[PDB]
Design an enzyme around this catalytic site. Sequence first.
Site, PDB file in Angstrom:
ATOM      1  N   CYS B 399     -15.611  45.514   6.580  1.00 44.01           N
ATOM      2  CA  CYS B 399     -15.618  43.241   5.816  1.00 44.01           C
ATOM      3  C   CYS B 399     -17.053  43.410   6.197  1.00 44.01           C
ATOM      4  O   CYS B 399     -17.113  42.654   5.917  1.00 44.01           O
ATOM      5  CB  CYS B 399     -14.574  42.636   6.919  1.00 44.01           C
ATOM      6  N   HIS B 526      -8.948  42.573   7.545  1.00 43.96           N
ATOM      7  CA  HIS B 526      -8.939  43.586   8.612  1.00 43.96           C
ATOM      8  C   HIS B 526      -7.348  43.900   8.711  1.00 43.96           C
ATOM      9  O   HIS B 526      -6.765  43.818   9.218  1.00 43.96           O
ATOM     10  CB  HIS B 526      -9.264  42.688   9.824  1.00 43.96           C
ATOM     11  N   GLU B 528      -6.439  45.559  11.513  1.00 41.04           N
ATOM     12  CA  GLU B 528      -6.416  45.508  13.143  1.00 41.04           C
ATOM     13  C   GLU B 528      -5.305  43.982  13.043  1.00 41.04           C
ATOM     14  O   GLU B 528      -4.763  44.372  14.059  1.00 41.04           O
ATOM     15  CB  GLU B 528      -7.469  46.197  13.486  1.00 41.04           C
TER      16      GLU B 528
HETATM   17  N1  LIG Z   1     -15.866  39.087   9.273  1.00 39.81           N
HETATM   18  C1  LIG Z   1     -17.587  39.769   8.733  1.00 39.81           C
HETATM   19  O1  LIG Z   1     -16.981  40.667   9.003  1.00 39.81           O
HETATM   20  C2  LIG Z   1     -17.428  38.970   7.600  1.00 39.81           C
HETATM   21  C3  LIG Z   1     -18.201  39.912   6.587  1.00 39.81           C
HETATM   22  C4  LIG Z   1     -20.348  38.960   6.196  1.00 39.81           C
HETATM   23  N2  LIG Z   1     -19.944  37.008   6.494  1.00 39.81           N
HETATM   24  C5  LIG Z   1     -18.493  38.507   4.797  1.00 39.81           C
HETATM   25  O2  LIG Z   1     -18.057  37.366   4.609  1.00 39.81           O
HETATM   26  O3  LIG Z   1     -17.932  39.845   4.330  1.00 39.81           O
END
Ligand SMILES: NC(=O)CC[C@H](N)C(=O)O
Lengths: 556, 556, 556
Positions: B399, B526, B528
């Site tokens: 992300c 995510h 995880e």
């Molecule tokens: N959770 C994060 O690493 C956020 C990354 C970035 N702010 C996004 O919205 O893509």
Amino acid sequence: MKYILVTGGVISGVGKGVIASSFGTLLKSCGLDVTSIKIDPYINIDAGTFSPYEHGEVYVLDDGAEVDLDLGNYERFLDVTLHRDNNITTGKIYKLVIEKERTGEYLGKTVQVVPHITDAIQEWVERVAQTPVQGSSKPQVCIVELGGTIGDIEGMPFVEAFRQFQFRVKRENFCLAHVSLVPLPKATGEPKTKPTQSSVRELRGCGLSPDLIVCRSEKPIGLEVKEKISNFCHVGPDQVICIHDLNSIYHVPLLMEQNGVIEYLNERLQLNIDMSKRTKCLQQWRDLARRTETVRREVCIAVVGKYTKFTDSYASVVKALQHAALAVNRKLELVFIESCLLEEETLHSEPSKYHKEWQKLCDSHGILVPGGFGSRGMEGKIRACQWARENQKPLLGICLGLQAAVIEFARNKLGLKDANTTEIDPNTANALVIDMPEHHTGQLGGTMRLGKRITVFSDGPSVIRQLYGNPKSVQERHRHRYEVNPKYVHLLEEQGMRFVGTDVDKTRMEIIELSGHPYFVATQYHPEYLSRPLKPSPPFLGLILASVDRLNQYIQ
Amino acid sequence: MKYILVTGGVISGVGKGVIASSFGTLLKSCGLDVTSIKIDPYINIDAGTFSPYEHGEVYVLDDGAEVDLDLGNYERFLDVTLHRDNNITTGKIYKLVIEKERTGEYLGKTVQVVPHITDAIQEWVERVAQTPVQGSSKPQVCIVELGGTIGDIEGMPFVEAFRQFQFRVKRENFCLAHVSLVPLPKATGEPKTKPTQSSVRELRGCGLSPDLIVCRSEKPIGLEVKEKISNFCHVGPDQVICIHDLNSIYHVPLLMEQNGVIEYLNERLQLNIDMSKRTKCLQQWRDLARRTETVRREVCIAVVGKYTKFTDSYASVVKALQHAALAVNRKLELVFIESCLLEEETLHSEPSKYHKEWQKLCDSHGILVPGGFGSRGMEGKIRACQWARENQKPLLGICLGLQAAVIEFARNKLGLKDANTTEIDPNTANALVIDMPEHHTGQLGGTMRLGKRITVFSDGPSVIRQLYGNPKSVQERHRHRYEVNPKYVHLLEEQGMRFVGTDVDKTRMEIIELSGHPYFVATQYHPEYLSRPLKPSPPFLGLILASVDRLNQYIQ
Amino acid sequence: MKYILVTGGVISGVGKGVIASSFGTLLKSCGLDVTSIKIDPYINIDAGTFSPYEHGEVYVLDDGAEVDLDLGNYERFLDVTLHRDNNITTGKIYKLVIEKERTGEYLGKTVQVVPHITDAIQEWVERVAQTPVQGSSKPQVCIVELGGTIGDIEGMPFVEAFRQFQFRVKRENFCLAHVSLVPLPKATGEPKTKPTQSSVRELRGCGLSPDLIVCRSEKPIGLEVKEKISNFCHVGPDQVICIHDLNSIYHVPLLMEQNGVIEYLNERLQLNIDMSKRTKCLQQWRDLARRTETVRREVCIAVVGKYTKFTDSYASVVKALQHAALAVNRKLELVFIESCLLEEETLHSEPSKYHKEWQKLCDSHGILVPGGFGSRGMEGKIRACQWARENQKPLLGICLGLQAAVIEFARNKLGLKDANTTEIDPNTANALVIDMPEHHTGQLGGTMRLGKRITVFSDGPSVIRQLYGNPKSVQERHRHRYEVNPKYVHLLEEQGMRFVGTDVDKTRMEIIELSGHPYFVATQYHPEYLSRPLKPSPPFLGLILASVDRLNQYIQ
Ligand SMILES: NC(=O)CC[C@H](N)C(=O)O
Ligand SMILES: Nc1ncnc2c1ncn2[C@@H]1O[C@H](COP(=O)(O)OP(=O)(O)CP(=O)(O)O)[C@@H](O)[C@H]1O
Ligand SMILES: Nc1ncnc2c1ncn2[C@@H]1O[C@H](COP(=O)(O)OP(=O)(O)CP(=O)(O)O)[C@@H](O)[C@H]1O
Ligand SMILES: Nc1ncnc2c1ncn2[C@@H]1O[C@H](COP(=O)(O)OP(=O)(O)CP(=O)(O)O)[C@@H](O)[C@H]1O
Ligand SMILES: O=c1ccn([C@@H]2O[C@H](COP(=O)(O)OP(=O)(O)OP(=O)(O)O)[C@@H](O)[C@H]2O)c(=O)[nH]1
Ligand SMILES: O=c1ccn([C@@H]2O[C@H](COP(=O)(O)OP(=O)(O)OP(=O)(O)O)[C@@H](O)[C@H]2O)c(=O)[nH]1
Ligand SMILES: O=c1ccn([C@@H]2O[C@H](COP(=O)(O)OP(=O)(O)OP(=O)(O)O)[C@@H](O)[C@H]2O)c(=O)[nH]1
Ligand SMILES: NC(=O)CC[C@H](N)C(=O)O
Ligand SMILES: NC(=O)CC[C@H](N)C(=O)O
């Protein structure tokens, strides 16, 4: 600035309000500019959703806020015009902090009770104690009154906040006065000091140490108990003030001055009070306290209310009557007539009570029909208005006795037996009282006509305008939704009625009078919220005068 | 229902989370349906405005809520899908009560901490413990974990609430376990029990008496200290559990079962657990705990992050790596490389640190580029992505390593040295990453793509789709605003890049891959947060496999 | 006078003794006259009925009192000779007050904890802090050390007493230093401040507010934790002293001076300390602290004791050995040999332990046979004395190694296999050790030869008399009932034995020696109670010298 926190001990309802107002009037007679704050630890933004049985006659401030009644004591003793931020609650604080958090003004960090809530409380107190409250003069002393009792789970945030505040503001700019109760049971027949001991111990167990200990008892206590308290509280023998049950409350400031509290404070907060000139400043209060004992005339007034089971639900009304009487040099005697016991439904249940209450009402020199909300017990108010109109008995109605009086006039001179408000029965055929929200019709900001508004006087010689000083207009505090119907205006004005007061738009009548009746004034506003001890409200003044048959003489 | 409140003693950070999750997994292996609740006494609706340094790696639930990480422990141990109301805070409670008040649901009465706030807490707990959390099955046990330490001013409302709750729910349906610390200083060289004594005393001074006392120490303590605690706490000698520092945390449930806690609870809460069948239910956990000791292969992974000064800001990531390793039968070794020390700005300051960190990064078998917010330390992430692309080193981005990888590909294959996000520098000429708020464009309800969403697989043989089981789509938890630019899609796809995963609208790419690279997967979600000990996330699994050169074999 | 109360926090055993002794030596190097007091909240007139396992090596004062060992720290750091009234207990106080009551000195009134017990405590402290303790000089500072932890039910009388004392003595003549523990668990890997917070809160909840907060940790803590403590305790950032685990305890006064405690106190108690001259007063302690690091010679000594499971049951012995070593410029290494494991009864049980302990004893450069009471483990002492007599190994016995040595000589040179004391077996045929109560034979006042007594030297060149400075007599502290038999005097003196020291009546031998042995001195008195850091006891000094083969050189 210099602060004086006032705390309570054994019980709630021991007199912190009068203690604080007395500190205030003392400091204000010595040439200072005092302000005041009341801390209610309850989770309530304000007292709009309250019933008088709960906390005693919701007050109203000039900006429209509905607050506790202790602010009324402050306003009546110091002669000031407080604001909304002078009434702190747990809800205000937590809501402010939660909004700040959700917005992001506590960026990234964890919000906890300590230090954030206490910092909010401190910043609130500091910001508020600097708001010019008697014009443009900046305050020099701020009297905080912490409602409740020290020990409860509701007021720990505030005690911690002030524990930090005394260090934050250089203790030479901070005092703490503890008001406690000295019970004198009838079995032991001896004053007991152990409650005060436990309260001071609980307090010191929170980080605060009293400078004064005002002991409230029913009868005076001797030097033995004073020195016992001094020992078991590590306070001197001269900073333990003893305040017994006095005749009136205008004695309290005097009983405090005589006990050397002015000097103590001048030496403890370093206020620079010129002693040689602080003589003969409480002369007005000495005169008032003497007039409280030197009046024997027995003027009797009837308070036709629905909460009459409580004597605190009409505090401002009773006190305005007392002020007016003292200005007329008469000894007020109040009979509290419950309006529910004037209806025939109790005649079918307890004729004894019915006839007793009607007798009370009949052998009185005057009638006061206070305000109120709801429907329980309004028919009795209308019966009383009628009886006072058919027996040449003075009457004063306040924002609900006006509606009741108009209803009576309608249903007893126009024969409209269906005359009523839109509140008691909405689907009525005839409706003399209808809603006129200030601006809720259009938005949600401003439904009830709360706060101080202008009222101009329609042309015509009126006794109420003569009492007010023959002005063009008056500023008075309103709290009401309903209003007299603008269509029945002539239906009821081509008769013994006269609308002498209205707003600038001439669509809201709030001062009426009867033709031929000696005194039948009724107001849609609350004139008791501007009645100070040295300044009685003109309406109550005229009521008392006409009740003793002296009004015409007073005018001429 | 039956409740098990878990409280803390001397310090915060002693292990209540694992204790509670262990109670939960024990009761859940014995045939029950457990639910869980976490009570954070801080004034914060949720953990959206938090930084990882504060409370350790904000979690994310399926409905979009951002909560503490302890709910992650609950989800990973009990295999459940909690909700937003399973995370109580002081702010939620006070805000609910204040809204209720302003509306008028407390009609006429005074709102105080006691009883109204505590009644809100009780009703919340009761309502939440009945929400089916693993499908449609109704819970039978609820494990409440009261964050903080007993004695603080933040958590008195909750302690009072539960003091009343034990009477409200018939103590045979209520237990309280107190977790305390037994310090063993190096001077005295003897375990000290006085902290636990003071904590139990403070607790009992609030109306609660422990049933279990879990004593957390670094090394095992003897029966002498156990019996001392039993005496000075009026608990038996068998309901004083001793939990030292174990190798892993899959030992805790076993160390509790062996100490007879299952039997104690079955006898104390009257759960009707058939003993003869409660054997060989923790077999999976015994196997997992044995595999934690019987693995010696030393797979090393690089965690290129910006908060690497903390080991709790990547809890879920580390734990998913551990799960995958244990499933691959390898001993994980994690090196925490700070991405700030990979930029040339530190080469001009401390070449030693620069070369040391780059050495660490270079002698590792794999690279993980976690997520994060802001700008500090992203250039290092791009350097690392490039180095792992030019040295055939596996890499996984989450992300933010995806955005960094795309930026690297752009500025190192298209020569667009100005490639960047709209976050680091908004007025850039070339912008590979732009905002695409879910629906905030149109309203305020739904700005960030929070919660579980669908991701379908674009056609083409992909190793990541093979790892996921060759499905058509996956449900994964998103927390992000930005997105890959839809105009540079072909500018970067006519090269060694491939977008294999997107949403149902085909306008948001969230699974990319490199052509020719052994493993260069990167995900916008995510993975995880769905990695349970007995179910490793496919991405981390493939990362570990390719890092030991076993992925192709695992597929075939 | 000016008082410095020292209080404890999280646990007991955190270092208040050394903190207080360090305050004392600082103030005493700056030209003052300090005294000290120890308040043990236990119900025990004195420590005569105590076992070393309980409170660590009962001390002995010049007047015969048996007290705690902390008074030993005071005596060793300030170089003073305290008295019996310098050790307050709850029993002393309550007994004094009860006697006063029964006599009638509280005539007619009711005696309560407050104010009578606290007034007794205050009067005791004031009377004792004015007793000339270093000759005829009157003290100026008194360091009270309140044993226990603030919060316990044992020490509330004292905390209340001092709460009143700070007002009774004009706070400018009173300071309070709070010693707390900052635990650094191995899980969180971060110092925790919450214990100190709770302790300071409990303290302030008793009426006392700290001026200094000495935080005891294992490793140094940073300015972050210092400022956190300063905030959450309303103390400055410079009056929060941090004292980690140092090499020796001669570093503590220096680590305190360097932290500006001398200046703080001089400004807070108004002591009028001339700064320009308070330089180079701790030079001796700096030298001693440097010699604690600059010694590498590894002299090893054997401590053949029976309580060797504890290292505090020989505090004075160990510390006297350390003083002597530092004066000889050697690095002491102590092996604690349990005398029970030298008897054949363990050879029949664990030959491993037997041979291991005998190996330890055999590869050491010297042997020390301390004192003790009872019978468990004396045979091993006799075995060790014999082995050190048959292997030319130095030995020193103290009030029980002397009896054991005489018993060994008897049963191994006179063949009297029945040689023994009247304590182990009273009905023995041969008795080398018999009771000789000082004056209990005749009365009850004076059974044990307690306190400082004279010992004259019988004619004959003796190494022990040469070490003592070749005097005629010495004053030493005795604690013993038994004595060497006066009939076997010649039976054992017509051999390798020599009695060089006895009392003025020549009926009690308390210094013996062996002929031909390099060093086999044994004393019936306790020479370790007069061993100050800058003044090592001659016996231990000679033991160390002969143990490194330097004694003869040191003499010549
Ligand atoms: N959770 C994060 O690493 C956020 C990354 C970035 N702010 C996004 O919205 O893509
Ligand atoms: N010394 C005194 N002597 C005579 N009357 C007194 C008195 N003190 C108080 N009173 C009367 O009793 C009433 C007590 O109400 P008061 O507001 O003063 O105390 P309280 O404890 O209710 C403040 P809070 O509600 O904030 O706790 C006063 O209004 C006053 O009329
Ligand atoms: N008995 C134990 N043995 C080994 N490791 C343990 C352990 N108990 C806890 N740990 C580890 O230390 C960490 C402590 O964090 P944990 O969440 O369990 O306590 P905590 O006090 O921080 C909960 P809260 O933040 O709500 O107060 C755990 O995540 C675990 O990895
Ligand atoms: N800062 C420090 N650094 C190194 N060693 C220390 C130390 N403080 C104490 N020690 C050692 O640990 C021992 C702790 O015993 P100490 O008497 O000082 O504390 P305490 O709490 O037991 C007094 P009391 O028994 O009256 O409560 C000391 O004798 C000393 O040898
Ligand atoms: O019945 C009793 C009452 C009291 N006492 C003991 O004698 C003392 C008497 O003290 P009290 O409790 O009788 O009263 P007080 O002096 O503290 O303050 P007042 O309530 O009188 O205003 C108390 O300290 C208590 O310990 C008893 O032993 N028995
Ligand atoms: O220095 C001291 C320490 C303690 N005491 C008194 O002796 C008792 C010893 O009790 P402790 O405080 O030394 O420890 P504990 O047994 O309560 O628990 P642990 O910390 O060891 O795990 C306490 O009750 C105290 O009153 C002293 O008189 N002086
Ligand atoms: O698990 C937790 C821990 C703490 N908190 C809340 O966040 C705050 C964190 O405060 P802590 O209790 O974690 O530590 P501290 O800063 O008071 O001192 P140290 O032990 O670190 O030295 C506390 O005020 C608590 O209310 C939680 O909400 N949940
Ligand atoms: N204060 C009152 O008596 C309210 C009366 C009525 N509810 C009105 O608004 O006019
Ligand atoms: N202090 C001791 O070692 C006492 C030894 C023996 N009880 C004696 O009186 O001689």
